[PDB]
Amino acid sequence: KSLDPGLKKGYWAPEEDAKLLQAVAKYGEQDWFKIREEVPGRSDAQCRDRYLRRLHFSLKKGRWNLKEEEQLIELIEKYGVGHWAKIASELPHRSGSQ
DNA sequence: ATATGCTTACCGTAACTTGAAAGTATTTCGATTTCTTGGCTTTATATATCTTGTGGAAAGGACGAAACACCGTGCTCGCTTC
């Protein structure tokens, strides 16, 4: 993921919306090593988290309404603090990064 | 004029995979051991035969002494010369 002349450190999505989203239907959620051979400028390490955080569906998003605080409470009430504790390993997709 | 907060590029460790080197109880080839089978000597009385030693023979070898070959020589025979 570094010192590579073929990688691109860009920020926007030039051609990515196709080059990376084709893997959605082309290949499953495993063996990312196969896709990196066709998409230039993109590495597997960043590709995994990009694919994950861009196409996910079930996430607590929207405006902070009068009913979201109970959601947060029952979230931190599942197993513990969650954000960094080891319980983060079983919280489904609620990693500390977010 | 700037903070809540999302997005996410790049800096970490944990369990699983693919292949090579070292390591573990298996079987077969080949060497080794041990089961045969016959001989190694010891005795006694018995004996006819048959191959081997102790005779003989003698072919196979050189070295020796006298004879013969010619040829010198003076004897014992010849001669010219005075």
Nucleotide nearest A16 (Cα, C1'): B8
Q: Which string of DSSP letters, residue by residue, matches A4-67?
A: -TTB---SS-TTHHHHTTHHHHHS-SS-GGGGGGTSTB--HHHHHHHHHHHH------S---TT
Task: Please tell me the experimental approach by which this structure was elucidated.
Answer: cryo-EM
Whole-angstrom CA distances from A50 to A17, A29, A38, A54 are 11, 13, 17, 6
Q: Which nucleotides of B are covered by protein (CB under 7 A)?
A: 5-12
Q: Which nucleotide is nearest to A50 (CA to C1')?
A: B8
User: Is A7:A41 a contact under the CB 8 Å cutoff?
Assistant: yes
How many angstroms separate the CA of A75 from the C1' of B61? 142
Which nucleotide lies closest to A2 by the C1' atom and the CA atom? B10
